[PDB]
Protein backbone atom coordinates (compact mmCIF):
# COMPACT_ATOMS: atom_id res chain seq x y z
CA UNK A 1 0.00 0.00 0.00
CA UNK A 2 1.60 3.27 -1.21
CA UNK A 3 2.31 6.12 1.22
CA UNK A 4 2.57 8.60 -1.69
CA UNK A 5 0.27 9.66 -4.51
CA UNK A 6 0.39 11.76 -7.66
CA UNK A 7 -1.66 14.97 -7.66
CA UNK A 8 -2.00 18.15 -9.68
CA UNK A 9 -0.38 21.13 -7.93
CA UNK A 10 -1.66 24.62 -8.43
CA UNK A 11 1.30 26.23 -10.26
CA UNK A 12 4.05 23.58 -10.47
CA UNK A 13 2.49 20.92 -12.72
CA UNK A 14 2.17 17.44 -11.28
CA UNK A 15 3.69 16.45 -7.96
CA UNK A 16 3.75 13.84 -5.24
CA UNK A 17 2.05 14.16 -1.84
CA UNK A 18 1.75 12.12 1.37
CA UNK A 19 -1.21 9.75 1.75
CA UNK A 20 -0.51 9.14 5.48
CA UNK A 21 1.59 11.08 7.97
CA UNK A 22 5.28 10.26 7.55
CA UNK A 23 8.09 10.10 10.11
CA UNK A 24 11.77 10.90 9.54
CA UNK A 25 13.51 8.02 7.91
CA UNK A 26 10.36 6.39 6.54
CA UNK A 27 10.95 4.61 3.20
CA UNK A 28 8.44 6.09 0.68
CA UNK A 29 9.38 4.44 -2.61
CA UNK A 30 12.16 2.43 -4.16
CA UNK A 31 12.98 1.99 -7.79
CA UNK A 32 15.36 0.54 -10.27
CA UNK A 33 15.97 2.82 -13.31
CA UNK A 34 13.89 2.60 -16.43
CA UNK A 35 17.36 2.89 -18.02
CA UNK A 36 20.78 4.04 -16.85
CA UNK A 37 24.41 4.31 -17.95
CA UNK A 38 27.80 4.81 -16.39
CA UNK A 39 28.87 8.44 -16.79
CA UNK A 40 31.66 9.79 -18.99
CA UNK A 41 34.32 10.23 -16.33
CA UNK A 42 33.63 6.85 -14.71
CA UNK A 43 33.53 4.64 -17.74
CA UNK A 44 36.25 2.02 -17.43
CA UNK A 45 36.70 2.93 -13.73
CA UNK A 46 33.46 1.30 -12.50
CA UNK A 47 31.44 -1.71 -13.65
CA UNK A 48 28.88 -0.87 -16.37
CA UNK A 49 26.23 -2.92 -14.52
CA UNK A 50 26.69 -2.51 -10.74
CA UNK A 51 28.59 0.82 -10.80
CA UNK A 52 31.28 -0.47 -8.40
CA UNK A 53 34.96 0.35 -8.71
CA UNK A 54 37.45 -2.48 -9.20
CA UNK A 55 41.14 -2.37 -10.02
CA UNK A 56 40.54 -5.00 -12.74
CA UNK A 57 37.54 -4.73 -15.06
CA UNK A 58 36.97 -6.96 -18.05
CA UNK A 59 35.89 -5.54 -21.43
CA UNK A 60 33.03 -6.71 -23.60
CA UNK A 61 34.95 -8.53 -26.28
CA UNK A 62 32.51 -7.38 -29.00
CA UNK A 63 32.79 -3.61 -28.59
CA UNK A 64 35.75 -3.28 -26.14
CA UNK A 65 33.83 -0.31 -24.65
CA UNK A 66 31.58 -1.64 -21.90
CA UNK A 67 33.55 -2.98 -18.93
CA UNK A 68 32.38 -5.33 -16.15
CA UNK A 69 33.55 -6.46 -12.72
CA UNK A 70 32.54 -10.11 -13.27
CA UNK A 71 31.12 -12.59 -15.74
CA UNK A 72 27.91 -12.34 -13.68
CA UNK A 73 27.58 -8.57 -14.26
CA UNK A 74 28.46 -9.03 -17.96
CA UNK A 75 25.72 -11.63 -18.47
CA UNK A 76 23.06 -9.72 -16.49
CA UNK A 77 23.90 -6.54 -18.44
CA UNK A 78 23.56 -8.21 -21.84
CA UNK A 79 19.85 -7.43 -22.53
CA UNK A 80 20.50 -3.74 -21.86
CA UNK A 81 23.82 -3.76 -23.73
CA UNK A 82 22.91 -5.91 -26.72
CA UNK A 83 21.49 -3.16 -28.95
CA UNK A 84 24.10 -0.52 -28.08
CA UNK A 85 27.15 -2.80 -28.44
CA UNK A 86 27.48 -2.35 -32.22
CA UNK A 87 26.92 1.41 -31.88
CA UNK A 88 29.63 1.87 -29.27
CA UNK A 89 31.99 -0.20 -31.43
CA UNK A 90 31.45 1.95 -34.53
CA UNK A 91 32.59 5.19 -32.94
CA UNK A 92 35.50 4.02 -30.71
CA UNK A 93 37.59 6.16 -29.51
CA UNK A 94 34.81 8.75 -30.05
CA UNK A 95 32.04 8.29 -27.54
CA UNK A 96 28.49 9.66 -27.36
CA UNK A 97 27.37 12.21 -24.75
CA UNK A 98 25.87 10.49 -21.70
CA UNK A 99 22.39 11.74 -22.61
CA UNK A 100 22.62 10.03 -26.04
CA UNK A 101 23.76 6.72 -24.61
CA UNK A 102 21.00 6.91 -21.98
CA UNK A 103 18.29 7.66 -24.52
CA UNK A 104 19.57 4.81 -26.73
CA UNK A 105 18.79 2.45 -23.86
CA UNK A 106 15.42 4.12 -23.08
CA UNK A 107 13.92 3.67 -26.56
CA UNK A 108 14.18 -0.11 -26.55
CA UNK A 109 12.73 -0.31 -23.03
CA UNK A 110 9.68 1.60 -24.24
CA UNK A 111 8.93 -1.25 -26.64
CA UNK A 112 8.53 -3.73 -23.78
CA UNK A 113 4.93 -4.87 -23.32
CA UNK A 114 5.42 -5.64 -19.62
CA UNK A 115 4.78 -2.65 -17.30
CA UNK A 116 8.00 -1.25 -15.87
CA UNK A 117 7.91 -1.00 -12.09
CA UNK A 118 9.90 2.24 -12.45
CA UNK A 119 6.87 3.76 -14.23
CA UNK A 120 4.24 2.76 -11.63
CA UNK A 121 3.34 6.36 -10.64
CA UNK A 122 4.40 8.23 -13.82
CA UNK A 123 5.68 7.07 -17.20
CA UNK A 124 8.29 8.22 -19.65
CA UNK A 125 5.53 9.74 -21.81
CA UNK A 126 4.20 11.64 -18.78
CA UNK A 127 7.56 13.33 -18.14
CA UNK A 128 7.74 17.12 -18.29
CA UNK A 129 9.65 18.45 -21.33
CA UNK A 130 9.20 22.23 -20.79
CA UNK A 131 9.19 22.41 -24.59
CA UNK A 132 7.29 25.69 -24.70
CA UNK A 133 9.62 27.37 -22.14
CA UNK A 134 12.98 26.48 -23.70
CA UNK A 135 15.31 29.24 -24.84
CA UNK A 136 16.52 29.33 -28.43
CA UNK A 137 20.06 28.34 -27.41
CA UNK A 138 18.66 25.34 -25.53
CA UNK A 139 16.54 24.26 -28.51
CA UNK A 140 19.64 24.46 -30.72
CA UNK A 141 21.55 22.25 -28.30
CA UNK A 142 18.71 19.73 -28.33
CA UNK A 143 18.70 19.72 -32.14
CA UNK A 144 22.42 18.89 -31.97
CA UNK A 145 21.75 15.94 -29.58
CA UNK A 146 19.08 14.67 -31.98
CA UNK A 147 21.58 14.62 -34.84
CA UNK A 148 24.19 12.94 -32.64
CA UNK A 149 21.67 10.25 -31.63
CA UNK A 150 20.66 9.62 -35.22
CA UNK A 151 24.32 9.09 -36.13
CA UNK A 152 25.25 7.07 -33.04
CA UNK A 153 22.25 4.70 -33.42
CA UNK A 154 22.37 4.23 -37.19
CA UNK A 155 23.34 0.53 -37.15
CA UNK A 156 20.21 -0.28 -35.05
CA UNK A 157 17.66 2.46 -35.96
CA UNK A 158 17.52 4.31 -39.29
CA UNK A 159 14.06 5.95 -39.17
CA UNK A 160 11.31 7.10 -36.83
CA UNK A 161 9.05 4.32 -38.09
CA UNK A 162 11.25 1.87 -36.14
CA UNK A 163 10.36 3.51 -32.81
CA UNK A 164 6.90 3.99 -31.22
CA UNK A 165 4.89 6.69 -32.99
CA UNK A 166 4.20 8.54 -29.75
CA UNK A 167 7.96 8.88 -29.23
CA UNK A 168 9.47 12.11 -30.55
CA UNK A 169 13.23 12.37 -30.45
CA UNK A 170 13.50 16.14 -29.83
CA UNK A 171 10.94 16.01 -27.04
CA UNK A 172 12.64 12.92 -25.62
CA UNK A 173 15.90 14.79 -25.15
CA UNK A 174 14.03 17.68 -23.52
CA UNK A 175 12.54 15.14 -21.10
CA UNK A 176 15.93 13.52 -20.48
CA UNK A 177 17.49 16.94 -19.66
CA UNK A 178 15.07 17.91 -16.94
CA UNK A 179 14.19 14.43 -15.58
CA UNK A 180 17.48 12.53 -15.32
CA UNK A 181 19.07 11.70 -11.96
CA UNK A 182 22.80 11.65 -11.19
CA UNK A 183 23.66 8.30 -9.63
CA UNK A 184 26.23 8.48 -6.82
CA UNK A 185 28.20 5.54 -5.32
CA UNK A 186 28.43 4.84 -1.58
CA UNK A 187 31.23 7.42 -1.20
CA UNK A 188 29.02 10.01 -2.99
CA UNK A 189 31.16 10.13 -6.15
CA UNK A 190 29.06 10.61 -9.33
CA UNK A 191 29.22 7.34 -11.27
CA UNK A 192 26.17 7.28 -13.55
CA UNK A 193 22.94 8.80 -14.83
CA UNK A 194 19.47 7.27 -15.06
CA UNK A 195 15.77 7.87 -15.66
CA UNK A 196 13.42 7.01 -12.80
CA UNK A 197 10.05 8.26 -14.07
CA UNK A 198 7.92 7.75 -10.91
CA UNK A 199 10.59 9.61 -8.85
CA UNK A 200 10.52 12.44 -11.42
CA UNK A 201 7.13 13.45 -10.02
CA UNK A 202 8.88 15.13 -7.04
CA UNK A 203 9.11 18.91 -7.34
CA UNK A 204 12.16 20.83 -6.08
CA UNK A 205 12.82 22.71 -2.86
CA UNK A 206 16.11 24.07 -1.53
CA UNK A 207 14.74 22.94 1.93
CA UNK A 208 13.16 19.58 0.99
CA UNK A 209 11.24 17.15 3.16
CA UNK A 210 12.51 14.03 1.32
CA UNK A 211 15.88 12.73 0.19
CA UNK A 212 17.07 10.14 -2.31
CA UNK A 213 20.07 7.85 -1.96
CA UNK A 214 21.51 5.29 -4.37
CA UNK A 215 22.64 1.77 -3.69
CA UNK A 216 24.25 0.97 -7.02
CA UNK A 217 21.55 1.81 -9.65
CA UNK A 218 18.81 1.27 -7.08
CA UNK A 219 17.10 4.40 -5.74
CA UNK A 220 15.58 4.81 -2.25
CA UNK A 221 13.27 7.77 -1.46
CA UNK A 222 12.96 8.59 2.27
CA UNK A 223 11.29 11.26 4.38
CA UNK A 224 13.88 13.39 6.24
CA UNK A 225 11.35 15.30 8.39
CA UNK A 226 7.88 14.75 9.76
CA UNK A 227 5.35 15.23 6.96
CA UNK A 228 1.59 15.76 7.36
CA UNK A 229 -1.15 14.01 5.40
CA UNK A 230 -1.60 15.75 2.06
CA UNK A 231 1.72 17.64 2.26
CA UNK A 232 3.63 17.86 -1.04
CA UNK A 233 6.86 15.81 -1.09
CA UNK A 234 9.96 17.57 -2.37
CA UNK A 235 13.64 16.87 -3.02
CA UNK A 236 16.58 19.19 -3.71
CA UNK A 237 17.68 18.95 -7.38
CA UNK A 238 20.93 20.76 -6.55
CA UNK A 239 24.21 20.61 -4.68
CA UNK A 240 23.85 22.24 -1.27
CA UNK A 241 27.04 24.26 -1.55
CA UNK A 242 25.59 26.95 -3.88
CA UNK A 243 24.46 30.48 -3.13
CA UNK A 244 20.86 31.50 -3.82
CA UNK A 245 21.90 33.31 -7.01
CA UNK A 246 23.77 30.21 -8.23
CA UNK A 247 20.82 27.99 -7.39
CA UNK A 248 18.32 30.24 -9.14
CA UNK A 249 20.49 30.39 -12.25
CA UNK A 250 20.81 26.59 -12.51
CA UNK A 251 17.09 25.99 -11.85
CA UNK A 252 16.11 28.63 -14.45
CA UNK A 253 18.52 27.35 -17.08
CA UNK A 254 17.96 23.57 -16.66
CA UNK A 255 14.44 23.26 -15.20
CA UNK A 256 12.76 26.43 -16.51
CA UNK A 257 11.43 27.86 -13.29
CA UNK A 258 12.27 30.64 -10.83
CA UNK A 259 12.75 29.21 -7.36
CA UNK A 260 10.63 31.10 -4.83
CA UNK A 261 11.38 28.80 -1.84
CA UNK A 262 12.04 30.32 1.59
CA UNK A 263 15.82 30.01 1.33
CA UNK A 264 16.02 31.61 -2.14
CA UNK A 265 13.75 34.50 -1.18
CA UNK A 266 15.68 35.24 2.04
CA UNK A 267 19.29 34.57 0.80
CA UNK A 268 19.52 32.02 3.59
CA UNK A 269 23.23 31.23 4.45
CA UNK A 270 24.61 33.27 1.48
CA UNK A 271 26.75 35.46 3.75
CA UNK A 272 28.36 32.45 5.42
CA UNK A 273 28.95 30.71 2.07
CA UNK A 274 30.79 33.78 0.72
CA UNK A 275 32.89 34.47 3.87
CA UNK A 276 36.16 36.25 2.98
CA UNK A 277 37.40 38.59 0.25
CA UNK A 278 35.89 38.07 -3.20
CA UNK A 279 39.20 38.87 -4.91
CA UNK A 280 40.57 35.84 -3.00
CA UNK A 281 37.74 33.38 -3.27
CA UNK A 282 36.90 34.13 -6.92
CA UNK A 283 40.29 32.60 -7.79
CA UNK A 284 39.36 29.42 -5.91
CA UNK A 285 36.00 29.22 -7.66
CA UNK A 286 37.74 29.46 -11.02
CA UNK A 287 40.32 26.77 -10.13
CA UNK A 288 37.52 24.46 -9.06
CA UNK A 289 36.37 24.08 -12.66
CA UNK A 290 39.47 22.08 -13.51
CA UNK A 291 39.58 20.31 -10.13
CA UNK A 292 36.01 19.04 -10.47
CA UNK A 293 36.69 17.80 -14.02
CA UNK A 294 39.78 15.90 -12.83
CA UNK A 295 37.81 14.43 -9.90
CA UNK A 296 35.06 13.31 -12.30
CA UNK A 297 37.70 11.25 -14.20
CA UNK A 298 39.14 9.87 -10.91
CA UNK A 299 42.54 11.49 -11.42
CA UNK A 300 43.36 11.70 -7.76
CA UNK A 301 47.05 12.62 -7.88
CA UNK A 302 46.24 15.59 -10.10
CA UNK A 303 43.30 16.61 -7.91
CA UNK A 304 45.47 16.51 -4.81
CA UNK A 305 48.31 18.54 -6.34
CA UNK A 306 45.92 21.32 -7.42
CA UNK A 307 44.13 21.32 -4.07
CA UNK A 308 47.32 21.46 -1.96
CA UNK A 309 48.53 24.53 -3.85
CA UNK A 310 45.26 26.36 -3.15
CA UNK A 311 44.98 25.23 0.48
CA UNK A 312 48.51 26.26 1.44
CA UNK A 313 48.39 29.59 -0.42
CA UNK A 314 45.08 30.79 1.13
CA UNK A 315 45.65 29.63 4.70
CA UNK A 316 46.24 33.14 6.03
CA UNK A 317 43.26 34.79 4.27
CA UNK A 318 40.34 32.52 3.37
CA UNK A 319 38.20 30.66 5.97
CA UNK A 320 37.21 27.03 5.51
CA UNK A 321 33.52 27.90 5.66
CA UNK A 322 33.76 29.69 2.30
CA UNK A 323 32.00 27.21 -0.03
CA UNK A 324 34.73 27.31 -2.72
CA UNK A 325 37.50 26.63 -0.18
CA UNK A 326 35.25 23.97 1.38
CA UNK A 327 34.84 22.16 -1.93
CA UNK A 328 38.63 22.20 -2.39
CA UNK A 329 39.08 20.65 1.05
CA UNK A 330 36.53 17.98 0.24
CA UNK A 331 38.24 17.21 -3.09
CA UNK A 332 41.56 17.02 -1.24
CA UNK A 333 40.12 14.69 1.43
CA UNK A 334 38.64 12.30 -1.16
CA UNK A 335 41.83 12.32 -3.24
CA UNK A 336 43.85 11.41 -0.14
CA UNK A 337 41.45 8.62 0.85
CA UNK A 338 41.64 7.16 -2.63
CA UNK A 339 45.48 7.42 -2.64
CA UNK A 340 45.94 5.89 0.81
CA UNK A 341 47.21 9.06 2.44
CA UNK A 342 45.05 8.65 5.47
CA UNK A 343 46.69 11.06 7.92
CA UNK A 344 46.47 13.85 5.33
CA UNK A 345 42.87 12.90 4.48
CA UNK A 346 41.89 13.33 8.14
CA UNK A 347 43.56 16.72 8.30
CA UNK A 348 41.34 18.00 5.42
CA UNK A 349 38.24 16.07 6.45
CA UNK A 350 38.19 17.35 10.04
CA UNK A 351 38.18 20.88 8.64
CA UNK A 352 34.94 20.20 6.72
CA UNK A 353 32.90 19.06 9.75
CA UNK A 354 31.59 22.35 11.10
CA UNK A 355 30.88 23.87 7.64
CA UNK A 356 29.01 20.68 6.75
CA UNK A 357 26.94 20.93 9.96
CA UNK A 358 25.89 24.45 8.90
CA UNK A 359 25.24 23.86 5.19
CA UNK A 360 23.56 20.37 5.43
CA UNK A 361 21.02 20.99 8.20
CA UNK A 362 18.82 18.21 9.54
CA UNK A 363 19.49 14.82 7.98
CA UNK A 364 21.28 14.91 4.62
CA UNK A 365 23.02 11.84 3.13
CA UNK A 366 26.03 13.87 2.01
CA UNK A 367 26.76 14.95 5.58
CA UNK A 368 26.10 11.45 6.93
CA UNK A 369 28.70 9.96 4.60
CA UNK A 370 31.20 12.73 5.22
CA UNK A 371 30.97 12.27 9.00
CA UNK A 372 31.31 8.49 8.55
CA UNK A 373 34.47 9.00 6.47
CA UNK A 374 36.00 11.22 9.17
CA UNK A 375 35.06 8.78 11.96
CA UNK A 376 36.55 5.92 9.97
CA UNK A 377 39.82 7.86 9.54
CA UNK A 378 39.93 8.69 13.26
CA UNK A 379 39.29 5.05 14.18
CA UNK A 380 42.14 3.73 12.07
CA UNK A 381 44.50 6.46 13.35
CA UNK A 382 43.68 5.39 16.90
CA UNK A 383 41.64 8.38 18.12
CA UNK A 384 38.83 6.31 19.59
CA UNK A 385 36.69 8.77 21.59
CA UNK A 386 36.62 11.21 18.67
CA UNK A 387 35.86 8.43 16.17
CA UNK A 388 33.12 7.02 18.35
CA UNK A 389 31.46 10.42 18.57
CA UNK A 390 31.53 10.91 14.81
CA UNK A 391 30.47 7.35 13.98
CA UNK A 392 27.52 7.73 16.35
CA UNK A 393 26.63 11.04 14.71
CA UNK A 394 26.85 9.46 11.27
CA UNK A 395 24.48 6.68 12.35
CA UNK A 396 21.97 9.20 13.72
CA UNK A 397 21.95 10.89 10.28
CA UNK A 398 22.16 7.78 8.12
CA UNK A 399 19.42 5.83 9.86
CA UNK A 400 17.18 8.60 8.44
CA UNK A 401 18.83 9.19 5.06
CA UNK A 402 19.99 5.65 4.17
CA UNK A 403 17.96 3.25 6.33
CA UNK A 404 18.29 -0.51 6.76
CA UNK A 405 17.60 -1.05 3.06
CA UNK A 406 21.00 0.53 2.19
CA UNK A 407 24.09 -1.64 2.63
CA UNK A 408 26.27 1.21 4.04
CA UNK A 409 24.39 0.90 7.38
CA UNK A 410 25.82 -2.56 8.04
CA UNK A 411 29.32 -1.18 7.37
CA UNK A 412 28.74 1.63 9.87
CA UNK A 413 27.50 -0.78 12.55
CA UNK A 414 30.68 -2.83 12.15
CA UNK A 415 32.82 0.29 12.60
CA UNK A 416 30.86 1.32 15.69
CA UNK A 417 31.39 -2.12 17.20
CA UNK A 418 35.12 -2.05 16.42
CA UNK A 419 35.54 1.44 17.89
CA UNK A 420 33.72 0.37 21.05
CA UNK A 421 36.03 -2.66 21.38
CA UNK A 422 39.13 -0.43 21.23
CA UNK A 423 37.66 1.90 23.84
CA UNK A 424 37.05 -0.99 26.23
CA UNK A 425 40.59 -2.33 25.72
CA UNK A 426 41.99 1.04 26.91
Amino acid sequence: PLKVEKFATANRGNGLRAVTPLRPGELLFRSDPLAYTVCKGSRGVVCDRCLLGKEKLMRCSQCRVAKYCSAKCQKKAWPDHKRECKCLKSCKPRYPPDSVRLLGRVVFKLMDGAPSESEKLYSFYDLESNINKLTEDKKEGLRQLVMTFQHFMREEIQDASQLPPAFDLFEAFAKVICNSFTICNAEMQEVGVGLYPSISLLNHSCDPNCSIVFNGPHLLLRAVRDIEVGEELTICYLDMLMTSEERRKQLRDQYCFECDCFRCQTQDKDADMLTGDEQVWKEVQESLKKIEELKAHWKWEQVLAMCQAIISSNSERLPDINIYQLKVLDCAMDACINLGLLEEALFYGTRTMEPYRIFFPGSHPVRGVQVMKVGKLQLHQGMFPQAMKNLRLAFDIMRVTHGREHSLIEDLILLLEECDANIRAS
Binding site: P96, S180, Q254
Partner: peptide
Protein backbone atom coordinates in the same frame (compact mmCIF):
# COMPACT_ATOMS: atom_id res chain seq x y z
CA UNK B 1 29.55 14.28 -29.95
CA UNK B 2 27.21 18.15 -21.00
CA UNK B 3 26.26 18.04 -17.32
CA UNK B 4 22.57 17.38 -16.66
CA UNK B 5 20.71 15.43 -13.98
CA UNK B 6 19.14 15.98 -10.57
CA UNK B 7 21.32 15.75 -7.47
CA UNK B 8 25.02 15.00 -7.26
CA UNK B 9 28.11 14.71 -5.05
CA UNK B 10 26.77 17.43 -2.70
Amino acid sequence: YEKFGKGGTY
